[PDB]
Amino acid sequence: ADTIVAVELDTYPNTDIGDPSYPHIGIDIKSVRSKKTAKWNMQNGKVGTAHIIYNSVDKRLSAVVSYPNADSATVSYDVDLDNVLPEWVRVGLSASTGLYKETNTILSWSFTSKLKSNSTHETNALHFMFNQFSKDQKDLILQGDATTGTDGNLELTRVSSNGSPQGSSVGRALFYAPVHIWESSAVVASFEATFTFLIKSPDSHPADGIAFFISNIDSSIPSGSTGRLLGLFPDAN
Amino acid sequence: ADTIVAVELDTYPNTDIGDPSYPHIGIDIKSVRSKKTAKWNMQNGKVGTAHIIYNSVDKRLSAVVSYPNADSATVSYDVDLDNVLPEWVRVGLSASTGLYKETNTILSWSFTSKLKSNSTHETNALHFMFNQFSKDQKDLILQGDATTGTDGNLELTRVSSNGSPQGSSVGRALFYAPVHIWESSAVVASFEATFTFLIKSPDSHPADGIAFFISNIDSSIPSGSTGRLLGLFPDAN
Amino acid sequence: ADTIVAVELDTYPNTDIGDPSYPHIGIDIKSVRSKKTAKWNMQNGKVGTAHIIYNSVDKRLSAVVSYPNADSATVSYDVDLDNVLPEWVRVGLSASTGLYKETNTILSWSFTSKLKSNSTHETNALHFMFNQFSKDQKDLILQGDATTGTDGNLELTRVSSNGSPQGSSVGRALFYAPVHIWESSAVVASFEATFTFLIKSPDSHPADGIAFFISNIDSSIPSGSTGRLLGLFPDAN
Amino acid sequence: ADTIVAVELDTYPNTDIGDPSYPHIGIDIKSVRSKKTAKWNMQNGKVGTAHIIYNSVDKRLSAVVSYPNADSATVSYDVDLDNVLPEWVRVGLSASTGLYKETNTILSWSFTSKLKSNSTHETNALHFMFNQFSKDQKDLILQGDATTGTDGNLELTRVSSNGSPQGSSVGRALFYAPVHIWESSAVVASFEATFTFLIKSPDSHPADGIAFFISNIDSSIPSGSTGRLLGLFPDAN
Numbered sequence: 001a002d003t004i005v006a007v008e009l010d011t012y013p014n015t016d017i018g019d020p021s022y023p024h025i026g027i028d029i030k031s032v033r034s035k036k037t038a039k040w041n042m043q044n045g046k047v048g049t050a051h052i053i054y055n056s057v058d059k060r061l062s063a064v065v066s067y068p069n070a071d072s073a074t075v076s077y078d079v080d081l082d083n084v085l086p087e088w089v090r091v092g093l094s095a096s097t098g099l100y101k102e103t104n105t106i107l108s109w110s111f112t113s114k115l116k117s118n119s120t121h122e123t124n125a126l127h128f129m130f131n132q133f134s135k136d137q138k139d140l141i142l143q144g145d146a147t148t149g150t151d152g153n154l155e156l157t158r159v160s161s162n163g164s165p166q167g168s169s170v171g172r173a174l175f176y177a178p179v180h181i182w183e184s185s186a187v188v189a190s191f192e193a194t195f196t197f198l199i200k201s202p203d204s205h206p207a208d209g210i211a212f213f214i215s216n217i218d219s220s221i222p223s224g225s226t227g228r229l230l231g232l233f234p235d236a237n
Numbered sequence: 238a239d240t241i242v243a244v245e246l247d248t249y250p251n252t253d254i255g256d257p258s259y260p261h262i263g264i265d266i267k268s269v270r271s272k273k274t275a276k277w278n279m280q281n282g283k284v285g286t287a288h289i290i291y292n293s294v295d296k297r298l299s300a301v302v303s304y305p306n307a308d309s310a311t312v313s314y315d316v317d318l319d320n321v322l323p324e325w326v327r328v329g330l331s332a333s334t335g336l337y338k339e340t341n342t343i344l345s346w347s348f349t350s351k352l353k354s355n356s357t358h359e360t361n362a363l364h365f366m367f368n369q370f371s372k373d374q375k376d377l378i379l380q381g382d383a384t385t386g387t388d389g390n391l392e393l394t395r396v397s398s399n400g401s402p403q404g405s406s407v408g409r410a411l412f413y414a415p416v417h418i419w420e421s422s423a424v425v426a427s428f429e430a431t432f433t434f435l436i437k438s439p440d441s442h443p444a445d446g447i448a449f450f451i452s453n454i455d456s457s458i459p460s461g462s463t464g465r466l467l468g469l470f471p472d473a474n
Numbered sequence: 475a476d477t478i479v480a481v482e483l484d485t486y487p488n489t490d491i492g493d494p495s496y497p498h499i500g501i502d503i504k505s506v507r508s509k510k511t512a513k514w515n516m517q518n519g520k521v522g523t524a525h526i527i528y529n530s531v532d533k534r535l536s537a538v539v540s541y542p543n544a545d546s547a548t549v550s551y552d553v554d555l556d557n558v559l560p561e562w563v564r565v566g567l568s569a570s571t572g573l574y575k576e577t578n579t580i581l582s583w584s585f586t587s588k589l590k591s592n593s594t595h596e597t598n599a600l601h602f603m604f605n606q607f608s609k610d611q612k613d614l615i616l617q618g619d620a621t622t623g624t625d626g627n628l629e630l631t632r633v634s635s636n637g638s639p640q641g642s643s644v645g646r647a648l649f650y651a652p653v654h655i656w657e658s659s660a661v662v663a664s665f666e667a668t669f670t671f672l673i674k675s676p677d678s679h680p681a682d683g684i685a686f687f688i689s690n691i692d693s694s695i696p697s698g699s700t701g702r703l704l705g706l707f708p709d710a711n
Numbered sequence: 712a713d714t715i716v717a718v719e720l721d722t723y724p725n726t727d728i729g730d731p732s733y734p735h736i737g738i739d740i741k742s743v744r745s746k747k748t749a750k751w752n753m754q755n756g757k758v759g760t761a762h763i764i765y766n767s768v769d770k771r772l773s774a775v776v777s778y779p780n781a782d783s784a785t786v787s788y789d790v791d792l793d794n795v796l797p798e799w800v801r802v803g804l805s806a807s808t809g810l811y812k813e814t815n816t817i818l819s820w821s822f823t824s825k826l827k828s829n830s831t832h833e834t835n836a837l838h839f840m841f842n843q844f845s846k847d848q849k850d851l852i853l854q855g856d857a858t859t860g861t862d863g864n865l866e867l868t869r870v871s872s873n874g875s876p877q878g879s880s881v882g883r884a885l886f887y888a889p890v891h892i893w894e895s896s897a898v899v900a901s902f903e904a905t906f907t908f909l910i911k912s913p914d915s916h917p918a919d920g921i922a923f924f925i926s927n928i929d930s931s932i933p934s935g936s937t938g939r940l941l942g943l944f945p946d947a948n
């Protein structure tokens with residue numbers, strides 16, 4: 001069983017699993033059933049930006065999702081990540097479609113992690129930035145339907161050759177290196193992730209979402225995690 | 238009068254102006270009477286580290302102070318800094334001694350500030366890092382008794398040639414450029430500051446401490462602000 | 475008398491003072507008569523990118539200027555800046571027009587400087603990034619006709635309210651803090667500068683160009699330096 | 712066979728394979744016989760620093776190795792890495808011993824690589840920093856004898872529990888993620904690596920040295936590459 005901590009941008013309300021009745025962002029700790037949610041005015045066909053941040057002093061995971069000239073959506077949850085995640089993790093982007101669909105296009109993605117130790121007071125750090133993705137992107141582990149390099153973008157779910165999204169699709173990109181996301185003797189450990197995304201559907205009703213996640217390093221897409229499970233979780237519990 | 242936000246490392250309790258009875262760290266919002274404090278076991282003669290963080294999403298100002306292999310002191314305070322500080326500020330370090338005294342040596346100092354705006358979703362950033370200081374540190378504004386370049390360090394308060402700290406002293410160092418700390422159309426604004434410091438005293442009670450601070454751009458040491466007022470405040474209100 | 479090292483993007487050939495016969499980029503060392511030039515195919519009304527790099531092992535000053543899908547222009551020159559510049563400098567952007575004109579619009583400007591010292595092997599750093607400019611950009615020193623905040627851009631030279639550039643104009647923007655560009659006891663010093671620019675003109679001959687520049691700190695626009703002198707030199711010697 | 716680009720810190724002169732008659736630094740392009748070398752006064756039992764840099768514009772690989780308060784050794788060589796390395800590489804540190812020996816202790820290692828592409832003018836970047844190494848260091852592929860976590864250091868070759876180095880030992884540590892060190896449509900690509908090291912020995916001629924290297928991603932320690940081959944090269948050609 002994978003251990004997953006995620007920020008979801010959920011375009012599709014599954015109220016039978018506790019989604020609120022509108023598109024929303026959410027903080028998920030080991031369950032697709034978010035611990036905290038906020039209303040999110042998703043705009044179909046427009047480029048937005050997400051930002052996720054955490055530090056071990058406040059022990060607060062927070063995210064803001066925004067479109068230019070619009071009010072942002074923000075959500076926050078108090079959680080000690082060293083009580084949840086293993087010491088080493090991978091970081092990644094997940095998306096999915098079900099019986100409804102949307103393109104789940106990533107235009108850019110960056111991540112910074114820092115860990116300062118208490119025995120020495122010295123820092124380890126990891127930064128990456130993709131402002132474009134190439135066809136053979138060897139520092140990403142591409143899972144399920146994820147492909148890269150079409151127009152320099154990362155397409156987490158299937159897009160047909162005429163530009164339309166496909167239903168029942170699930171794809172992830174994980175950064176190739178493990179990340180040391182906490183250490184018992186860190187005075188302060190932090191991270192921040194940013195990604196710009198383009199969710200478009202010719203349907204009145206898009207689905208299902210894109211999430212930023214942190215997992216056990218050996219994580220894979222759970223069996224049948226298309227749809228509301230966002231490529232993250234083996235079931236709806 | 239100046240507008241000051243600060244994290245203080247207060248080595249000397251002045252309980253007649255509301256300090257805790259022990260050496261403490263504190264978050265000071267336009268007053269020397271800290272909005273929040275925590276017990277801090279200052280170690281006479283050991284090099285310690287301080288980290289200060291804040292972001293516009295959680296609107297939480299937090300600091301950790303620690304020495305190698307000791308429990309850290311942490312203090313935090315919910316505060317929207319866009320309601321407190323002008324849009325443009327200077328950042329700095331300050332220290333004083335009074336009738337009791339200590340060296341207030343800075344061995345390094347770094348700072349990072351970022352603003353991502355909401356009309357363009359583009360980010361401005363300022364980073365600086367000092368891991369030694371030179372005799373002529375042209376990018377620092379020294380006030381009061383502050384000097385640099387003695388052993389490559391920043392001495393915030395006055396030290397004799399035989400290395401002994403002096404009483405009734407006060408000294409500040411500000412980074413030279415104004416810093417854009419918030420902006421009305423920013424999706425996320427954040428900063429982080431680190432410094433390493435060395436407080437040594439021949440007295441049984443060292444006084445008075447060291448602060449990291451954020452101020453109006455034209456800020457200067459208030460008249461009479463040696464001792465308990467830390468070079469930051471004009472009175473004890 | 476100022477000391478200027480500059481990379482010029484020279485849009486107007488003044489062959490009577492050594493310019494090649496075509497738009498060109500150049501490295502200037504204390505003279506507007508370039509020590510080295512490369513052919514530059516400036517594209518009217520297109521947003522381009524310029525990159526400037528130097529380090530104190532190579533002692534080589536190099537620049538690349540390009541537009542999306544074109545061949546870049548590159549120019550490199552061998553010079554120890556230890557011998558040319560003072561130890562503390564300001565970095566800047568400058569631009570001018572004379573009888574002929576162009577908008578000299580900067581859309582982004584970044585700069586990183588790093589110094590690692592010989593006695594301690596410790597490391598000082600300055601980084602700034604502007605991806606937009608506001609109306610009151612307090613960490614810029616604005617000289618001559620330079621203004622910021624028009625469309626979130628920096629217009630180095632005078633533009634009418636109707637969008638039209640003006641002749642006989644000169645402007646500059648310097649970063650506010652002095653920069654420690656070399657230190658006698660450095661194992662390696664380096665810097666990198668990036669800006670993006672937009673040069674539009676109604677004229678068959680656009681004039682005069684834009685420059686990234688490094689100067690004595692107290693530098694100012696030399697009297698008469700519009701047009702060919704690019705806001706940098708007192709004369710064409 | 713592997714494709715290797717290295718900067719070597721060669722503490723033992725093997726004059727039969729073309730080493731000069733002293734300890735030296737060298738640039739190795741797919742052969743252990745350096746394309747350029749400089750004399751290097753290795754100091755037995757002192758912590759030194761090495762900095763290596765390159766960019767695609769000058770196309771010059773350069774390195775400085777230094778001890779506090781000593782003259783640095785520097786070496787440089789004009790080489791287009793486009794023409795030598797594949798598009799994706801791994802980066803690492805290698806060391807060896809042979810009949811003579813020495814501890815090959817890494818106390819810190821940093822690396823930064825950037826690509827600006829010419830179709831879009833956007834950058835992809837990778838940065839990593841270790842100031843401490845932990846026992847189970849997941850983002851490093853340790854090959855051969857290399858180990859981590861002893862006093863928070865990376866020991867490239869075998870050292871006994873009593874501090875003494877061992878002969879005929881070879882060990883490498885590779886960062887986990889492949890690095891995109893060039894791309895055909897890049898306006899500029901560059902990198903930088905820094906490491907600090909402690910070579911200590913009971914012998915009068917310590918051996919064999921330490922290298923920072925770049926390789927094909929599936930590179931491993933070639934057969935019998937102890938001693939003078941520095942864990943890099945399958946033979947002396």
Ligand SMILES: CCN(CC)c1ccc2c(c1)Oc1cc(N(CC)CC)ccc1C2c1ccccc1C(=O)OCCOCCOCCn1cc(CO[C@H]2O[C@H](CO)[C@@H](O)[C@H](O)[C@@H]2O)nn1
Pocket residue numbers: 012013014015016097098099100101207208226227228229
């Ligand atoms: C929120 C709107 N609601 C609640 C009142 C709703 C309810 C039922 C359907 C809904 C929608 O939509 C469809 C659409 C289709 N389409 C053709 C394949 C799309 C036009 C087929 C069946 C249904 C059904 C349906 C009707 C009869 C029998 C079975 C079902 C039906 O959807 O069966 C599969 C889902 O199982 C039923 C559990 O009911 C929960 C309520 N429901 C179902 C759905 C659609 O879910 C599917 O798509 C989602 C979006 O891609 C994914 O998050 C999810 O993982 C799954 O792939 N949402 N709400």
Ligand SMILES: CCN(CC)c1ccc2c(c1)Oc1cc(N(CC)CC)ccc1C2c1ccccc1C(=O)OCCOCCOCCn1cc(CO[C@H]2O[C@H](CO)[C@@H](O)[C@H](O)[C@@H]2O)nn1
Pocket residue numbers: 249250251253334335336337338444445463464465466
């Ligand atoms: C916390 C201990 N308490 C409260 C019961 C205390 C009270 C009085 C003194 C205290 C301590 O200490 C000294 C120390 C000295 N020294 C010689 C310079 C150092 C041994 C001289 C006079 C006093 C006096 C003293 C005795 C008789 C007449 C007047 C005074 C005396 O301190 O007069 C100066 C100001 O007195 C008003 C403050 O009254 C609050 C009680 N108090 C006084 C102090 C000493 O504060 C001075 O130094 C501090 C440490 O650097 C600063 O934070 C502060 O701004 C100031 O510079 N702290 N608590």
Ligand SMILES: CCN(CC)c1ccc2c(c1)Oc1cc(N(CC)CC)ccc1C2c1ccccc1C(=O)OCCOCCOCCn1cc(CO[C@H]2O[C@H](CO)[C@@H](O)[C@H](O)[C@@H]2O)nn1
Pocket residue numbers: 486488490571572573574575681682700701702703
């Ligand atoms: C030497 C004889 N005298 C004084 C007795 C003289 C006086 C004025 C001119 C003179 C000559 O010649 C020209 C020639 C031109 N030409 C067209 C480019 C050459 C036919 C244009 C304006 C003037 C002028 C002129 C007339 C009216 C108003 C202004 C000027 C005027 O700008 O004059 C500068 C002196 O230029 C004479 C020699 O330059 C040779 C050809 N030249 C001139 C120019 C115009 O340059 C102006 O624009 C350039 C492009 O932005 C700048 O790089 C430059 O810094 C300056 O701001 N380019 N190429």
Ligand SMILES: CCN(CC)c1ccc2c(c1)Oc1cc(N(CC)CC)ccc1C2c1ccccc1C(=O)OCCOCCOCCn1cc(CO[C@H]2O[C@H](CO)[C@@H](O)[C@H](O)[C@@H]2O)nn1
Pocket residue numbers: 723725727808809810811812918919937938939940
């Ligand atoms: C060619 C005749 N034969 C075969 C029967 C032969 C065999 C062994 C040796 C031979 C010769 O010569 C020497 C010479 C030395 N010398 C002191 C430097 C020269 C007198 C040291 C060890 C050996 C050895 C030797 C003795 C015991 C154990 C091993 C060897 C041993 O490793 O010998 C390797 C081949 O040595 C013959 C070529 O000699 C060139 C001069 N020499 C030898 C060495 C030591 O090299 C070793 O260490 C260096 C430093 O760690 C590494 O760079 C290097 O890759 C290797 O691990 N340096 N300079």
Ligand SMILES: [Ca+2]
Pocket residue numbers: 010011012013014019208209228
């Ligand atoms: Ca959902």
Ligand SMILES: [Ca+2]
Pocket residue numbers: 247248249250251256445465
């Ligand atoms: Ca106090």
Ligand SMILES: [Ca+2]
Pocket residue numbers: 484485486487488493682702
């Ligand atoms: Ca010209």
Ligand SMILES: [Ca+2]
Pocket residue numbers: 721722723724725730919939
């Ligand atoms: Ca050798």
Ligand SMILES: [Mn+2]
Pocket residue numbers: 008010019020024026032034
């Ligand atoms: Mn949800």
Ligand SMILES: [Mn+2]
Pocket residue numbers: 245247256257261263269271
């Ligand atoms: Mn206090």
Ligand SMILES: [Mn+2]
Pocket residue numbers: 482484493494498500506508
């Ligand atoms: Mn020119």
Ligand SMILES: [Mn+2]
Pocket residue numbers: 719721730731735737743745
């Ligand atoms: Mn060699």
